[PDB]
Symmetry: T
Subunit: 106 residues, 12 copies
Amino acid sequence: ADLEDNMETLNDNLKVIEKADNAAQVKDALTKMAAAAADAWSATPPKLEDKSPDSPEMHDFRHGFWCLIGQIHAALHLANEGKVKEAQAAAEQLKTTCNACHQKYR
Amino acid sequence: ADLEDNMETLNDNLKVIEKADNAAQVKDALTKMAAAAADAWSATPPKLEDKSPDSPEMHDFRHGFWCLIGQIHAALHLANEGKVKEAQAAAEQLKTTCNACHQKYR
Amino acid sequence: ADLEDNMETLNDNLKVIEKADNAAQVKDALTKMAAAAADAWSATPPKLEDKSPDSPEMHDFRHGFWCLIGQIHAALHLANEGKVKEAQAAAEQLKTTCNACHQKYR
Amino acid sequence: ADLEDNMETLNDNLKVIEKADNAAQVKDALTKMAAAAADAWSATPPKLEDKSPDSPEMHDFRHGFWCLIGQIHAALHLANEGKVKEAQAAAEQLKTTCNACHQKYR
Amino acid sequence: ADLEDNMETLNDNLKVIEKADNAAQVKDALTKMAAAAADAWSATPPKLEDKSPDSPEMHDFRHGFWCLIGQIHAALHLANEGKVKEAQAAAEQLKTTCNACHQKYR
Amino acid sequence: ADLEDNMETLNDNLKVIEKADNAAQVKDALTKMAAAAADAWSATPPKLEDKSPDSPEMHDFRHGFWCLIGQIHAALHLANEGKVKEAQAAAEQLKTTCNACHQKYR
Amino acid sequence: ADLEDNMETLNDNLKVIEKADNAAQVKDALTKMAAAAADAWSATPPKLEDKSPDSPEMHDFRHGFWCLIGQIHAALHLANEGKVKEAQAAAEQLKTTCNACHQKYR
Amino acid sequence: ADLEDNMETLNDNLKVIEKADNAAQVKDALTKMAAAAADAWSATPPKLEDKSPDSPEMHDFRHGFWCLIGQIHAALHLANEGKVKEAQAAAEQLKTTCNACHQKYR
Amino acid sequence: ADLEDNMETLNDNLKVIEKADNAAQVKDALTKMAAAAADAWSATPPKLEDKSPDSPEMHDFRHGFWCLIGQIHAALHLANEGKVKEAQAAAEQLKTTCNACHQKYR
Amino acid sequence: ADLEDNMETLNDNLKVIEKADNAAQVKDALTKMAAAAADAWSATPPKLEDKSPDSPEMHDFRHGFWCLIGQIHAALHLANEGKVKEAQAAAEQLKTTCNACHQKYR
Amino acid sequence: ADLEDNMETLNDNLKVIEKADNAAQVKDALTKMAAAAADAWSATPPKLEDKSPDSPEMHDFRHGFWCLIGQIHAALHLANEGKVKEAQAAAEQLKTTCNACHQKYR
Amino acid sequence: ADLEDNMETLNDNLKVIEKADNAAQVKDALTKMAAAAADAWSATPPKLEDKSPDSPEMHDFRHGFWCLIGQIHAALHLANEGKVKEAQAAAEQLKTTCNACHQKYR
Ligand code: HEM
Ligand code: HEM
Ligand code: HEM
Ligand code: HEM
Ligand code: HEM
Ligand code: HEM
Ligand code: HEM
Ligand code: HEM
Ligand code: HEM
Ligand code: HEM
Ligand code: HEM
Ligand code: HEM
Ligand SMILES: [Zn+2]
Ligand SMILES: [Zn+2]
Ligand SMILES: [Zn+2]
Ligand SMILES: [Zn+2]
Ligand SMILES: [Zn+2]
Ligand SMILES: [Zn+2]
Ligand SMILES: [Zn+2]
Ligand SMILES: [Zn+2]
Ligand SMILES: [Zn+2]
Ligand SMILES: [Zn+2]
Ligand SMILES: [Zn+2]
Ligand SMILES: [Zn+2]
Ligand SMILES: [Zn+2]
Ligand SMILES: [Zn+2]
Ligand SMILES: [Zn+2]
Ligand SMILES: [Zn+2]
Ligand SMILES: [Zn+2]
Ligand SMILES: [Zn+2]
Ligand SMILES: [Zn+2]
Ligand SMILES: [Zn+2]
Ligand SMILES: [Zn+2]
Ligand SMILES: [Zn+2]
Ligand SMILES: [Zn+2]
Ligand SMILES: [Zn+2]
Ligand SMILES: [Zn+2]
Ligand SMILES: [Zn+2]
Ligand SMILES: [Zn+2]
Ligand SMILES: [Zn+2]
Ligand SMILES: [Zn+2]
Ligand SMILES: [Zn+2]
Ligand SMILES: [Zn+2]
Ligand SMILES: [Zn+2]
Ligand SMILES: [Zn+2]
Ligand SMILES: [Zn+2]
Ligand SMILES: [Zn+2]
Ligand SMILES: [Zn+2]
């Protein structure tokens, strides 16, 4: 999938978690998010197509996905323990990271 | 995934198919559509909530999904054979199936 | 398994569902129902032996089982989400299909 | 495989079953036939490209494959149980369905 | 599955073996029985909750299942070798063990 | 893993069970216990090093592990059915098995 | 495999172990011994045919094999750790079980 | 396994096939023989260590195994088809190849 | 499959290759050819029945199939690289082997 | 597993390596450590429950596990080469990292 | 494999991509590179054998492989979309990273 | 992988074998050699491009690879048995096979 598609996936599954009333539904959504973010991690966005792999921007872009994957895994861990509310709140904290990266690079 | 979720997967992948520049992306999209449709197959839409599983409406709902799965498997056959423009055209024609069910039941 | 055997599987596992107090028990019983139903789909019931595979009675018989597999997956979806009383509710609805087919063909 | 290819699989394995003198030969041949019919179900024959996918013709065409698959599974079931002559006799009855569909859409 | 459920599996498959006319039917039925007995071995019957897990009663109760499993494997071994009447005769001898345990702890 | 190692796994997981707030943690713990006990089953404790594999002491050592595996499979059945308090209570009662072997052979 | 066949497997592989100069050879021979022993466990030896499956002779026979599988795993544990002379040593000890059972029942 | 070991597998399973009274016994025995011959093909017998790997002797030696494997597959094919007496007769013809090679290089 | 069946597989799939316009179709047909050829390798053709498995005619027959499997893999290698016209070219070359063997033995 | 449990796992397996006399035992222990550290990597310790995912502390916490995983993989690599002493010394170097993180965050 | 070998692998597959005329060949080569780099990531080169795991050099060494793996995954993504030229150009950009690390540490 | 590529794999792994200090490295190397040789088996070298697949030269080319695969499987047998010096010596003797084909066809 390409970057735009990984984002759609990230976005839609954020909304699935927000409306979810059960752990499995949260778990499924976080699994999809984890896969979408790992794919995206190696992507180069349009605004950075002229930048070299070792630029500060790239670094920063790759760091933001590694940060996102960390958090998804943490919420996924809570989801697996049946802790819906806590998983949802962890998901909600994720938005901070989506937005920070969007400000710089979207 | 619920009915809305499956519908979102179907529509999202339709767009991926439409903008694709290669077979793998098309095959991937249709593979996800097949999965979503197979799941949606056994669902009850809001407007048929009061109907019996053995009703004309529910027979009709379920046959729409069987029809769609059929057309997706056909399109997937083409993507697999690397036939992008053709898989794309088959996707466009599936939309008649999407629309027909919607008109009756959305 | 023969027709009688499959019926005995559908019937026991439906009792299992009826008295379960947990998702795993419902998940597992519904899975055994799907296989029994998928087997029975191809059978020829005593009362319809004098009949051709293209008769309206055999279309009816065969399609009784599609509708059953439909409702089984619906209930399995709810079971997978930990929703015991809702999977039980949806398992209750299967009986309308069991009853309709028995009325005409048992 | 295209329609023609599945048909060759179908015909070719019908003959294998006719000359077969052991259960295994019949099992494999009926297993190849099942997969060829399954794939074939999603196809559109030349005589029906002009037709809409909802049309009476397409419904009747695809029903023809699910009825063949039904009979194939029954035959297979018999062969799993080692009953070679009975699987062969049920394979002969399959010809009805072959010829019915050929008479209409071939 | 609880104790009662395994027993239903045990009894239900005993009957299948009695009316069976082919090796495969016997194989599967004896395979289901093995798994039901295996699961059953760890259970505590109502008549023995008062008892300590080391007690003579529990030892004799659990030994009853390993002896049944033994006979089940012997029967199965015969069925793998296609000897249908001999598997059926060994299945009849199983009744000894069924009734011995029922006489003491059921 | 050696005997000490297996014993450490058993004790550690006992504590995890005791402090758990969810089924997945309990199921996981017992799954590890089952593995450790299955391994320890075939070991020779320090104080029986001079005894024969066919001795009353070694019969007795090995039957303790068979008994424990039995109780763990029972408890695991409960954790699987999401029954936390009950799986916890079954775990506490296993301790009688731990103690009895220890008194004789540690 | 029948009783004679399984015995021939136990005997050859024990020679293999005896003359191996490497873990892999011992690992592999012990694995083949476990399966042969797991098969033989359900057999009825010529000398105990006139006997009921619940006799003390058949409890004895059956339990001869539990003890064998026990000692086999002990030696497999050492083999898995690359400890050739220690796995060979532990394989030497199996013979006490072979000998005891042969004394009473061969 | 060394050459001697494969030979023991070969010989040992030849006898199993001679006394076999069911297809399964023959299948497994011929399957073990195939793997033993396959492994054996790469070995160098004592009588030929002095020889170059291109020599007439090594070519003829290794050809002897591919010819045995050929006959083994033919026998196996017959056994898969349940024809027990015919598999046994083809196994008897295998002796030709056994003895031809033994006469030259054993 | 018997010799006739395998030949029918080689022949149909070679036509499939000849008229494919895509790698997947060629990949899949060549895979079915390898299995048919691997089966036929052990057969005995009518004309060589009066012959011993060590005759020059049977060495010739058997080695016809090694050479075929050789050329099949060559073409599968090109197919796997998406090279349709080159896999087709290499599939054309197989026929020299088909022809040579038919000249001497069909 | 939660953080406290991953640590127990880390700790116990450190002691297994220290007393290990064979590569397999070291390998098993490092595999368990690798899994415990990857789980822990996404955890938030008690002392940092008020800190945001992008705090310097979190960063630092995640960096310490990535450093630990690096080292475990390096020792695991040595263990796989049969280099016990070297693996043990690599394990011992690990303690530097455990302790550094404990000073700040435990 | 050790560091020197991972490098050979990296080097050879760089040359395979440079001469490749098809996506599969590129894909295969990048898969081999990805695996070689992940192995290498945990290695310690000769020039840094005296340095502690947390030295700036080690950090820097591990960062260079993580950067390389990122890029390989990006080229692998393009290769999977059938984009040969683009994959090759991404591979060529990789050399910047190989060389930078070689200047410091080789 | 093409012929050159396979040859590079063969030579590279030969060197790994020659400099190895442990079994796992040797086993790994030979495993890669086996794969490369199995692939090269079905290739046509530059200097035989104008020859038929049924030519003495192509028979001869292919038999060289069968011979090499044979010797590699023998050497691999030794590495598996942890026999480093011996696997090394078997590798050195394979070089005669490499050279003989080269002299004729490189
Ligand atoms: C779960 C968190 C995230 C969500 C919900 C999210 C959502 C989205 C959405 C809806 C879009 C618009 C896609 C489109 O239709 O074109 C987008 C685009 C984008 N996002 Fe994210 N995003 C997330 C995380 C991130 C992160 C962590 C980064 C960088 C580290 C990032 C970088 C970008 C970029 C560069 C685009 C523009 C892509 C293009 O123009 O091709 N996103 N995101
Ligand atoms: C590729 C074909 C299809 C596409 C792209 C598609 C797309 C959509 C979309 C975008 C929605 C909006 C739902 C929401 O998020 O609120 C929707 C809803 C819906 N669709 Fe589809 N659909 C397709 C096929 C079908 C078929 C075949 C059926 C009937 C058998 C169907 C039945 C419905 C129904 C009943 C709703 C209402 C959902 C609700 O309000 O809960 N769709 N669809
Ligand atoms: C989940 C729903 C169902 C349940 C619980 C159920 C249960 C049963 C039971 C307990 C029997 C008696 C078995 C015996 O002969 O000893 C039976 C018989 C039978 N059922 Fe069902 N059934 C179900 C669905 C169906 C459906 C959907 C059909 C038709 C499409 C059907 C057709 C029949 C027929 C033809 C028999 C008599 C066969 C004979 O004489 O052996 N059943 N069923
Ligand atoms: C097992 C039973 C069947 C057999 C043995 C069989 C056999 C065949 C054969 C030998 C052909 C000629 C293929 C060729 O032109 O190379 C064919 C074509 C065809 N068959 Fe069947 N068939 C069977 C079942 C069916 C069924 C059930 C249907 C419809 C539901 C069907 C529809 C067709 C169609 C539409 C063609 C024409 C394809 C074309 O012209 O491209 N067949 N079949
Ligand atoms: C294959 C032989 C066996 C058969 C056919 C069989 C069958 C049955 C049946 C039909 C029931 C009534 C279940 C119900 O109340 O719904 C039952 C209950 C029971 N059986 Fe068996 N059984 C067998 C072997 C055994 C063995 C070997 C033991 C003990 C070692 C055993 C112990 C029990 C117990 C304790 C109950 C009572 C469970 C309860 O009341 O909840 N059974 N069995
Ligand atoms: C869940 C139940 C059990 C728990 C929690 C448990 C726990 C322990 C613990 C913490 C140790 C200390 C060993 C050390 O690290 O030095 C130990 C040792 C030991 N346990 Fe257990 N155990 C259990 C079950 C059993 C059973 C069923 C047996 C006998 C069949 C057994 C036999 C022994 C023996 C012989 C030792 C001495 C080990 C040595 O000194 O080498 N344990 N156990
Ligand atoms: C690893 C240990 C064992 C070895 C090496 C071994 C070996 C053998 C051998 C070589 C034979 C002669 C086979 C023939 O009839 O041609 C034999 C027979 C026999 N063994 Fe074992 N055995 C072992 C364990 C056991 C055990 C544990 C038992 C009982 C629990 C047992 C019971 C028997 C019986 C009953 C026979 C005679 C069966 C007949 O007449 O066909 N063996 N054994
Ligand atoms: C299925 C047919 C065969 C049977 C039943 C068979 C059986 C045997 C037996 C029982 C031995 C004595 C093993 C020992 O010393 O412990 C042996 C040794 C041997 N066999 Fe075979 N064999 C067969 C096929 C072959 C073939 C086809 C070849 C050559 C192509 C061959 C070559 C040898 C060699 C070279 C030895 C001597 C090994 C040594 O001394 O270390 N055998 N075989
Ligand atoms: C890919 C290449 C090949 C193709 C396309 C092919 C095709 C065929 C066909 C269509 C038949 C007639 C089937 C029938 O009896 O109804 C046949 C027969 C036969 N072929 Fe092949 N073949 C091939 C390779 C070979 C090879 C390599 C050999 C020998 C090494 C061989 C030996 C035979 C024999 C002996 C028969 C007659 C068997 C009988 O009477 O039933 N074929 N072949
Ligand atoms: C192999 C290296 C390590 C070992 C052997 C080890 C061992 C331990 C042990 C025994 C505990 C006490 C657990 C308890 O009973 O509550 C602990 C706790 C802890 N460790 Fe580690 N540890 C290691 C690595 C690390 C690393 C790398 C970090 C941070 C990057 C870390 C952070 C912590 C924290 C935050 C706690 C307190 C957890 C709590 O209170 O819930 N540890 N460790
Ligand atoms: C795809 C990119 C790379 C290529 C093509 C490549 C190629 C090579 C080659 C051919 C060698 C000589 C190996 C020998 O025969 O001894 C080598 C060595 C080396 N490379 Fe790389 N390399 C790459 C990436 C890297 C990276 C990213 C690093 C560090 C982050 C690195 C660090 C080293 C080191 C330290 C050595 C010396 C190893 C020793 O002496 O044992 N290389 N590389
Ligand atoms: C372990 C044994 C072998 C090794 C180490 C080896 C090594 C090599 C090497 C390093 C090359 C240089 C190719 C290049 O990159 O341009 C080569 C080429 C070649 N080898 Fe081998 N080889 C071995 C076995 C064989 C065998 C058994 C054959 C024949 C059946 C063979 C046939 C060839 C041919 C024909 C070439 C020329 C490739 C070309 O110019 O395209 N090799 N080999
Ligand atoms: Zn992607
Ligand atoms: Zn960087
Ligand atoms: Zn910038
Ligand atoms: Zn769903
Ligand atoms: Zn969307
Ligand atoms: Zn209906
Ligand atoms: Zn059935
Ligand atoms: Zn009909
Ligand atoms: Zn197809
Ligand atoms: Zn046509
Ligand atoms: Zn055909
Ligand atoms: Zn329709
Ligand atoms: Zn259960
Ligand atoms: Zn009750
Ligand atoms: Zn029942
Ligand atoms: Zn006890
Ligand atoms: Zn262990
Ligand atoms: Zn511990
Ligand atoms: Zn004993
Ligand atoms: Zn057996
Ligand atoms: Zn008893
Ligand atoms: Zn071997
Ligand atoms: Zn000797
Ligand atoms: Zn033997
Ligand atoms: Zn040669
Ligand atoms: Zn065949
Ligand atoms: Zn010959
Ligand atoms: Zn965890
Ligand atoms: Zn950060
Ligand atoms: Zn702080
Ligand atoms: Zn490595
Ligand atoms: Zn650091
Ligand atoms: Zn420095
Ligand atoms: Zn290749
Ligand atoms: Zn190289
Ligand atoms: Zn030739």
